[PDB]
Amino acid sequence: ATSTKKLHKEPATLIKAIDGDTVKLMYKGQPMTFRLLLVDTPETKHPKKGVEKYGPEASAFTKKMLENAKKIEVEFDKGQRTDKYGRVLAYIYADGKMVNEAL
């Protein structure tokens, strides 16, 4: 394990905030989704029908730091958080930076 965490920065375009860490935006003109640590909305799929929710409690406010953020700085730490599919695992830094607007 080496210290390679810091996250860079690059403007993007609000496409659709899926959940807390999950967010859809174009950091390089490419519509994708970035989770980094990945939120936790899906919790065990039950056989009976449950209910569709746009976003959890605190993560719902995190969804706002992306639906109306004009200036963005998608910070992707050195060596993106890839794994099996190699998604764009990173965080968005627009309007508030780090999406930590809830204080």
From Swiss-Prot:
Where, in this chain's numbering, is Ca(2+) bound? Answer: 21, 40-41
| Record localization | Secreted
Query: What top-level branch of life does the organism fall under?
Result: Bacteria
| Active-site residues (renumbered) | 35, 43, 87
Q: What is the designated name of this protein?
A: Nuclease A
Q: Which organism is it from?
A: Staphylococcus aureus
What taxonomic classification does the UniProt entry list for its organism? Answer: Bacteria, Bacillati, Bacillota, Bacilli, Bacillales
**Part of the full-length chain shown:** 83 to 185 of 231
